[PDB]
Structures are given as C-alpha cells and as structure tokens.
Design a protein around this motif. Sequence first.
Motif, PDB file in Angstrom:
ATOM      1  N   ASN A 182     -29.468  -1.864  -2.046  1.00 54.98           N
ATOM      2  CA  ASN A 182     -28.240  -2.131  -3.157  1.00 54.98           C
ATOM      3  C   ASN A 182     -28.167  -1.077  -4.234  1.00 54.98           C
ATOM      4  O   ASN A 182     -27.377  -1.235  -4.933  1.00 54.98           O
ATOM      5  CB  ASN A 182     -28.396  -3.378  -3.122  1.00 54.98           C
ATOM      6  N   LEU A 183     -29.329  -0.386  -4.333  1.00 55.73           N
ATOM      7  CA  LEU A 183     -29.383   0.302  -5.432  1.00 55.73           C
ATOM      8  C   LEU A 183     -28.618   1.746  -5.363  1.00 55.73           C
ATOM      9  O   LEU A 183     -28.693   2.256  -4.151  1.00 55.73           O
ATOM     10  CB  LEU A 183     -30.821   0.887  -5.875  1.00 55.73           C
TER      11      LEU A 183
ATOM     12  N   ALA B 293     -22.548  -2.648 -12.820  1.00 53.22           N
ATOM     13  CA  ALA B 293     -23.333  -1.690 -13.545  1.00 53.22           C
ATOM     14  C   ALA B 293     -24.339  -2.533 -14.317  1.00 53.22           C
ATOM     15  O   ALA B 293     -24.362  -3.625 -14.561  1.00 53.22           O
ATOM     16  CB  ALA B 293     -22.128  -1.037 -14.257  1.00 53.22           C
ATOM     17  N   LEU B 294     -25.568  -1.350 -14.438  1.00 51.21           N
ATOM     18  CA  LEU B 294     -26.564  -2.180 -15.241  1.00 51.21           C
ATOM     19  C   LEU B 294     -26.926  -1.338 -16.541  1.00 51.21           C
ATOM     20  O   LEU B 294     -26.506  -0.061 -16.443  1.00 51.21           O
ATOM     21  CB  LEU B 294     -27.816  -1.777 -14.369  1.00 51.21           C
ATOM     22  N   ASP B 295     -27.174  -1.971 -17.557  1.00 46.16           N
ATOM     23  CA  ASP B 295     -27.463  -1.199 -18.847  1.00 46.16           C
ATOM     24  C   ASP B 295     -28.874  -0.783 -18.863  1.00 46.16           C
ATOM     25  O   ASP B 295     -29.928  -1.536 -19.042  1.00 46.16           O
ATOM     26  CB  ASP B 295     -27.066  -2.208 -20.123  1.00 46.16           C
ATOM     27  N   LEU B 296     -29.056   0.451 -18.810  1.00 47.67           N
ATOM     28  CA  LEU B 296     -30.426   1.107 -18.589  1.00 47.67           C
ATOM     29  C   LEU B 296     -30.778   1.852 -19.828  1.00 47.67           C
ATOM     30  O   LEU B 296     -30.254   2.807 -20.210  1.00 47.67           O
ATOM     31  CB  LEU B 296     -30.958   1.858 -17.390  1.00 47.67           C
TER      32      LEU B 296
ATOM     33  N   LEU C 147     -25.264   6.942 -13.750  1.00 48.30           N
ATOM     34  CA  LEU C 147     -24.837   5.552 -13.434  1.00 48.30           C
ATOM     35  C   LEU C 147     -25.579   5.116 -12.490  1.00 48.30           C
ATOM     36  O   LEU C 147     -25.986   5.683 -11.490  1.00 48.30           O
ATOM     37  CB  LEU C 147     -23.372   5.601 -13.178  1.00 48.30           C
ATOM     38  N   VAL C 148     -26.251   3.837 -12.796  1.00 51.17           N
ATOM     39  CA  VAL C 148     -26.952   3.061 -11.832  1.00 51.17           C
ATOM     40  C   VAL C 148     -26.013   1.826 -11.295  1.00 51.17           C
ATOM     41  O   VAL C 148     -25.575   1.080 -12.175  1.00 51.17           O
ATOM     42  CB  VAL C 148     -28.276   2.717 -12.442  1.00 51.17           C
ATOM     43  N   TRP C 149     -25.975   1.561 -10.236  1.00 53.66           N
ATOM     44  CA  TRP C 149     -25.386   0.322  -9.572  1.00 53.66           C
ATOM     45  C   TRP C 149     -26.279  -0.405  -8.896  1.00 53.66           C
ATOM     46  O   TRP C 149     -26.434  -0.100  -7.562  1.00 53.66           O
ATOM     47  CB  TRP C 149     -24.094   1.061  -8.880  1.00 53.66           C
TER      48      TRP C 149
END
Length: 106
Positions: A18-19, A34-37, A27-29
């Motif tokens: 799922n990553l 969406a994730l705040d990294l 952008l990371v999903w």
Amino acid sequence: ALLRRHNNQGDNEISVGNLRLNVTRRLVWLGETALDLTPKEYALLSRLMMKAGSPVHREILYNDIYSGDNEPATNTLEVHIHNLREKIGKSRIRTVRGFGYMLANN
DNA sequence: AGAAATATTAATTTCTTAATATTATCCTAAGCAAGGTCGTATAATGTGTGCAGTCTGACGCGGCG
C-alpha cells in the motif's frame, strides 16, 4: 532525473504494498491517503523503498540523512526509524540487528 | 518592497529507563579419533663401523734408555 534512473531503476513511482512513493514529486501515499513526512523520515523511507527487500547498512542510512558537517552525538537513526514506523506501521520496517533495517516486500 | 527583527508551529537531538527482544558466552556432559602400552611361547645365542689413504710440522710429553 539522474538519481531516479540510477537508484529507483528509472521508475518515478515505488510501489511496495500500500506504500506508493513518487520520488520526483516528494509524495508518499499510504494506501490512498497522503502522509505528512519530515525531511529525515522521507529520506530514510526513500532509501529503504529504493533498495526494496534488501537490508541497508546502518552507516549508509546515517550518511544518507546526516550531512558530513552536522553529525550528532547520540541515538538519532533509531528515533527516526521509530517515528517512521509510527507514521507507517510497525510491520513495514523490519529490524535486522547489526546490519541496519529492511523494508519488507513479502 | 526589501530586508529586519520577532513569535510560532515544527522538525530534532538528547537522555533515560525499561524493555525487549535478539543474540552470544559458558560449561559440562559426552563422544570419537588419535596416541601409548602390553602381549605374543618351534627354534632361533657375539661385530660392524665395512673402514683407510700416512697432510703437517713442530711440539708436548711420556718415556726411554
């Protein structure tokens, strides 16, 4: 473009479960959300996903997030991995004692 | 507007303990191959260096008459 062709084997999207990581768009999903990294966690996650399945050395990570000039004195890589695992889930980032960490593909 | 000083979120070392799981001593029991000793009852009863090519000149010295 260069970085992508060499490390990410030319692909603009790393798909591990799922990553999904767009290295070019930063952008990371997780799944579809969406994730705040933070910068550091993004760097670590990027490196782990590019070398999918194969454990990466601790020192490789330590260089990869820490510029030669600003090298800290205490436990940081571990805390960064902990927060990466909190924002992603303890399952993904498996720990290999002695030789750094590993993102699981299976 | 172009900085030029300020307040906020926010990304981040730093200890700290506990903890938490892995991992690596340890230690003794046991096992297996290797190394050491004994035991042999027909009869058997003395030797090889298997030679050695005179170097050599005084010289010590022990005789040596």
